[PDB]
Amino acid sequence: DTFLEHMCRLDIDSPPITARNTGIICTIGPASRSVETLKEMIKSGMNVARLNFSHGTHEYHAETIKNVRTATESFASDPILYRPVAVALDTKGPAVSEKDIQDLKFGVEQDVDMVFASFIRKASDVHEVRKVLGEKGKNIKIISKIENHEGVRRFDEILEASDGIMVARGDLGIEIPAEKVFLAQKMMIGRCNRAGKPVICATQMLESMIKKPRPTRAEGSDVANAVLDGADCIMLSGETAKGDYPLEAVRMQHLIAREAEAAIYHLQLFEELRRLITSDPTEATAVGAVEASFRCCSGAIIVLTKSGRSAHQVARYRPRAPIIAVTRNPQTARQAHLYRGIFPVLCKDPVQEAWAEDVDLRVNFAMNVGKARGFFKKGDVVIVLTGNTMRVVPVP
Amino acid sequence: DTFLEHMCRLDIDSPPITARNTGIICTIGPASRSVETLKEMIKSGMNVARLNFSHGTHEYHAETIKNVRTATESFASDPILYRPVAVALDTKGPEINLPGAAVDLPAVSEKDIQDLKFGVEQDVDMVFASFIRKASDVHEVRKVLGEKGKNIKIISKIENHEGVRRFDEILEASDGIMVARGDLGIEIPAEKVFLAQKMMIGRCNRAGKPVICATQMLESMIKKPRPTRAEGSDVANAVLDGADCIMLSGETAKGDYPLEAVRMQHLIAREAEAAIYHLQLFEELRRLAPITSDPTEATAVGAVEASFRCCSGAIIVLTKSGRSAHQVARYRPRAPIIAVTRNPQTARQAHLYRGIFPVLCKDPVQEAWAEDVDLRVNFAMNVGKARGFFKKGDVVIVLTGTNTMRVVPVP
Amino acid sequence: ADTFLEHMCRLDIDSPPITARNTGIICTIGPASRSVETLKEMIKSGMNVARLNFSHGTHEYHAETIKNVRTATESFASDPILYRPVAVALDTKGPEAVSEKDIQDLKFGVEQDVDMVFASFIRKASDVHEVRKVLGEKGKNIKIISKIENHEGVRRFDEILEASDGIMVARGDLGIEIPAEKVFLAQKMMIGRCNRAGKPVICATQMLESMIKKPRPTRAEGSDVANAVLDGADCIMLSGETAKGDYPLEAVRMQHLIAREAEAAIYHLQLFEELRRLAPITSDPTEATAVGAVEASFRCCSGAIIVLTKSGRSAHQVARYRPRAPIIAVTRNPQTARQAHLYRGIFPVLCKDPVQEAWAEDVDLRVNFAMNVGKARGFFKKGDVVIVLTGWRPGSGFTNTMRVVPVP
Amino acid sequence: DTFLEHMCRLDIDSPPITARNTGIICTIGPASRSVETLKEMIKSGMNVARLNFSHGTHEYHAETIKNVRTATESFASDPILYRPVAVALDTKGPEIAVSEKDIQDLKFGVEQDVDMVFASFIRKASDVHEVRKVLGEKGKNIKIISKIENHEGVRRFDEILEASDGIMVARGDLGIEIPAEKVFLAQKMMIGRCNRAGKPVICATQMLESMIKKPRPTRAEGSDVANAVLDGADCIMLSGETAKGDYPLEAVRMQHLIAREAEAAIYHLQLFEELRRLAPITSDPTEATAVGAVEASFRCCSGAIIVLTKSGRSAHQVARYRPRAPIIAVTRNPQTARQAHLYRGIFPVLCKDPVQEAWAEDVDLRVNFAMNVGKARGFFKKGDVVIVLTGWRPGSGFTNTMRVVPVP
Ligand SMILES: O=P(O)(O)OC[C@H]1O[C@](O)(COP(=O)(O)O)[C@@H](O)[C@@H]1O
Ligand SMILES: O=P(O)(O)OC[C@H]1O[C@](O)(COP(=O)(O)O)[C@@H](O)[C@@H]1O
Ligand SMILES: O=P(O)(O)OC[C@H]1O[C@](O)(COP(=O)(O)O)[C@@H](O)[C@@H]1O
Ligand SMILES: O=P(O)(O)OC[C@H]1O[C@](O)(COP(=O)(O)O)[C@@H](O)[C@@H]1O
């Protein structure tokens, strides 16, 4: 009923009985480059494979991308259990260096799902990046890395221009005093949550685990707090790129994140967002869905989406219940990992000629997915969204 | 944002830009008995015709019922504009003077048993059961009506101390409550009466059951063409208290100005809608609402939430028994509820609930169910457009099954 | 009671009111209530303010009424512990800006030492200023209450309210000008704004009209009074009921019962909490002191908030935030003791004891006096916790001290 | 108005416009043992010197205590600027109720006149009682802080909390027993309950481990400290950082900076408002007085809440409700001045002036002393509004008076 009291009844004896809602982004390098390691990392919880173009050639990275996709499709046999895995391109940065311009285009042909643009100071910088990507890769999400003072002063215009934000504490603190950094992090996560755009907490997550099999406690709580701050994704850098224990870092990331979900006071964030008028049918539909979900404790909110946006709008209001976003578009299934609470699910079944049946096919597919992964059981109540349409149905 | 501010920013210069959500129940008698008067009263806003069986014969009342129905069906030509009109039977109840604070032991007077039986065959929509002291009394009334009238809504008149003390068990047993204020103050001190009224309206609102404010609404208008305002503000406060319906007695039954009383009732009620602080009541109910597990309930919740979220012109609900519309009205949306039904009784009974605008579809049942549903939806759409609830392009919420919510633009 | 709905739900007519009446009763005095012996009864029945309607009567007539009111009032002066202050109000005839007839009536009010003035047909701030100017330096400590009786008064209510010391909603004159469906809106609006601004508001005209000829009121009238109290009105007024009717005394006794009952239906938490949200933020020691006092009073369920005041103003500031606990305003100024009845919840108490040379002793004297007053009237008992407000200096405008003390 | 907005309006361009409210506890050892280093650490912000009795003899620690007090009293010349410094004794505890070794260390604590004791491996209330029993009537004024370091301690935290005067979350020992991912939950749980109960809680172990060998810390450590402050911790503790490391002085200066910054990110409205909702109705004058004071302080943005206290409890009760304004606790008891550092927001101030025979004057003396302290340290200036709390009678337990006064 109150935040204080919610903190008071936190029980370490009760295990987390929810899936992880925070996305895990892993930087891939020498340590994690191999197909067999990537397999295990996906099994460990990796959602997005980051490529750092500060070093390496196009040939090198292209082989990394090939391995990532090879490993990912090893599980394609079971579509029910198949885990979509996004591919992110992180630019070297300085407006837009001559070198970046080629990496972005390389990104386009390599069909990357998103782009981490470095050292963004203003909206015009994001536009230039948008321009460079052009019509060809306009469906590639642009995530603006804030790494300096001006970027902070002009965060609002940057956020609107971008599809998402990355808080790079490492680069931030070189520029700004270390004691000011955590303030910037909380500010940006807040505004991104307010604006309903994905935010990523990045750099120096579990630096200790480069040489060690377990992390410190200052790192363990920092990750958890980032999740509690409202971050959509958490990122591992050197931990998975070069370290001795890349696989342990992911498994630890998973454990901490899943635990941190319990400490989340869902009532507050949802209710505060409600406090802050539309005319968009889909939006009003998403609102009703999230409201209903709290009132009947739904196992999940099943959403049929093509571009991902309808699921994104549901995630905006931050339901407790997991969002099962059903899509046949493999890119949107991969991009969905940027948003907290969305569990993307790729339907490989053939398009049924009868549209009503084809919709029912994708719904029941999600239903099977939910039961298998332990989201709900037969008899549980779930909400299904289709198109402007909300539906409260029992699980078959 | 706060209740104080809402009252402060009330502007009498700005006219009410909403329809009346409170039901008007008119007692019918000598003054309003004629078909031509009833016609006018329906156009003036009468929703429910009450019959007082304290006086009159079965022959007399039967003639009243015939006139009411005759007048009502004069508008049946246009189903788009047709306004359902309920028929209520108010029983005489057990009599003796009155003994304050005592526990009495009649139940259902011999005279009532005959009136209720008359009600069933006359096909009355609801019954105002007099002098209810306990749940067992409501059960006897339910049993007396039997299988014959199981669909007749029973409204329990609280008129004494014991009834108040045992209100909770009475409310659960009943389909609705009538605060018969007139009889209350005879039993209980006049200064205690307003407390009882507010208590009972509160609990009925909490329980999602219709409550009626009754007796001496506008007594002055029996002889006068306008009422006092002490009566006018009393009506307004009853509306603000949360009453679903307001009732005229002698005002329309015997008085010189029965038609003026209804038009005045309409004006005051419609005005009082503006003074309603909708956010509070809606939010307090959200807060008091338990976790359900009922699909239909969860559907109604999302609908009301959404309606606030997009300022919907209306919440269109397809219903058979009225129940689905009732569940939506429970959470008290600002937007009017257009309850679409083919059951004419359900269309008439809907007037007991605040905010529900019942609408009777007379179109034939289409063999294709999807088409038949769309037919009733578009019917409501024409219904909304005609009465000025919304226009083409406006956003409205449509409920169907019952588990489905839909946010659609007006054709 | 976490919600307003539940508060209404938990209303019990079986449980009797265990609070004093906080709403003031203003009685119009005329032929029926003129006699000293009747006035006694009305004071014993609960009358707080005697209104004089200058629509009719001569100065000779009214002057004797004032003499009658004061004679009856001072009959109880023997016991200062139980003495009930009784205000004298002058209600002007008004234009049928300021009619010449009013100009002499106001001056007459000054000479007669009236506590307040009900100014009729106020349309704007300049009207209130004219009334203020007319009263002049002579009686500038007389509270001006602006009667809103028309549309323009309603449209320009805000400028009128600041200029005035209080507001009177005259539904009777209102309903003539404005439609029989719009006043209750006007009534609630004006009471709201007066509550927001911390200025006394009075509900007037057609309170219990039935009781002119009848020994009992109607059912519509009883709830109308109750709702006015629940709306937030500081005072309720009887007109013909007490002026000419057959049962002026029964009207007061009924007014008292209804008002006392309506106190139970008040959801104190809301109004107090809503004012906290809207309170600006100050730097006035006296204001901050009052806030803490009202807060403390809720947090420890105080029997009363005892306030030493000279002009009444400090007690007014406590009442602004609407505590549940009664405010015992201790004063030696007899005028302010009479004027205090304009404010809901303030129980004025007149100390007649001589001024002690030691100021600390004089303060303690007035405090213990209130303590005895509280015990006598059944506000609290020995051992109960009460809040006492005082200042650091023997002057007015310096109350900065809050004290949580047990009842001796 | 909302938590989201408050986070959104965080501005790194605006420097912190507050003093540090979180206490800094420094473990003292070889690196920080010298009088001249301790001097610097006090100037850097050290409030409490911890002694780890896992190693070392009574001889060793006794000299440490002597140096701590020597360094502390070097500033005693100016009482206005004098900074009280507490002395904490951290027991070794049972290894694999109260070990035979601890019993001697605790008695050693009594003779050395330690201000508080960190009791290790507390599993239950009986353990805290045993520690209290051992300390006996001798040291009954020594605060007992129960170190939670295992599964059972967590499970039975509530009974432990009531028995103790405070709690220490020893994360280091916690994660050995419980999974590292479960710990932050335990930390937040215990800090919450201590905040709820108004008892001091300490975040301990592995604050800035990196600063043992490095001149600056990592960011995972920097944000961990900040979050502990935001969680609601009253004190933060440095261990090896100041005990043995190469940069003990840099650790304190860094601790201070992070803590001061984290104060800005605190959403004071929420915690204060949530506590009043959960606050029970109390008949204690001192409690109601503290409530009114904190309310007033928010309502007038007070520079400080000045509290005259003897045993410390009255300042503790004000801090319970978590005001934004700093609490200046005035006392002549040097132990309570040292113990005050356990509570967030309390700035203890030791009056060395002689006791005036006139008590009213003696009270005024201590008040103006706090006023000078506040002006000097930049808490407020002449003219600012501050809240002053005092009592009606000398001795402990009688503070019932709140006063809103301007700064001379
Ligand atoms: O989230 P998006 O990209 O707006 O797409 C939502 C669409 O998906 C659907 O659920 C299914 O549409 P398709 O069968 O064409 O994929 C539609 O109801 C709706 O228009
Ligand atoms: O309101 P009720 O009595 O529960 O019935 C609601 C019914 O109305 C409908 O919307 C229409 O069904 P019908 O074709 O029988 O009229 C159904 O979806 C639902 O079963
Ligand atoms: O309500 P007012 O007009 O401010 O009067 C309050 C004043 O009364 C006092 O309590 C005492 O004043 P007096 O001794 O002159 O009556 C002061 O502390 C305070 O300034
Ligand atoms: O916090 P504590 O221990 O109750 O001390 C509060 C005491 O301090 C005082 O303000 C001053 O008393 P002393 O002269 O003994 O210091 C008393 O009024 C009050 O009883």
Residue numbers in the entry:
A (entry chain C): 24 to 117, 220 to 401, 404 to 514, 523 to 531
B (entry chain A): 24 to 119, 210 to 514, 522 to 531
C (entry chain B): 23 to 118, 220 to 531
D (entry chain D): 24 to 119, 220 to 531
Paper text:
Pyruvate kinase isoform M2 (PKM2) converts phosphoenolpyruvate (PEP) to pyruvate and plays an important role in cancer metabolism. In contrast, PKM2 has low basal activity and is activated by an effector molecule fructose 1,6-bisphosphate (FBP). PKM2 exists in a dynamic population of monomer, dimer and tetramer and its pyruvate kinase activity relies on the formation of the tetramer. Upon formation of the tetramer, PKM2 can adopt the inactive T-state or active R-state conformation.
In addition, mutations K422R and H391Y of PKM2 (PKM2K422R and PKM2H391Y) were shown to decrease its pyruvate kinase activity in Bloom Syndrome (BS) patients, who are prone to cancer. To investigate the molecular mechanism for the regulation of PKM2 activity, we determined the crystal structures of PKM2K305Q, PKM2Y105E, PKM2R399E and PKM2K422R in the absence of FBP, in addition to PKM2K422R in the presence of FBP (PKM2K422R_FBP). The first striking observation from the structural analyses is that PKM2Oxalate, PKM2K305Q and PKM2K422R_FBP adopted the R-state conformation, whereas all other PKM2 mutants adopted the T-state conformation. Different from PKM2Oxalate or PKM2K305Q, PKM2K422R adopts a T-state conformation in the absence of FBP and an R-state conformation in the presence of FBP. Although PKM2K422R tends not to adopt a PEP-induced R-state conformation because of strong intermolecular interactions on the C-C′ interface (compared to PKM2Oxalate), association of FBP did favor the R-state tetramer formation. Moreover, FBP could induce the re-formation of the R-state tetramer of PKM2K422R. FBP could recruit the FAM to the FBP binding pocket on the C-C′ interface and facilitate R-state tetramer formation of PKM2. Thus, PKM2K422R shows low activity and high cooperativity in the absence of FBP but comparable activity to that of PKM2WT in the presence of FBP.
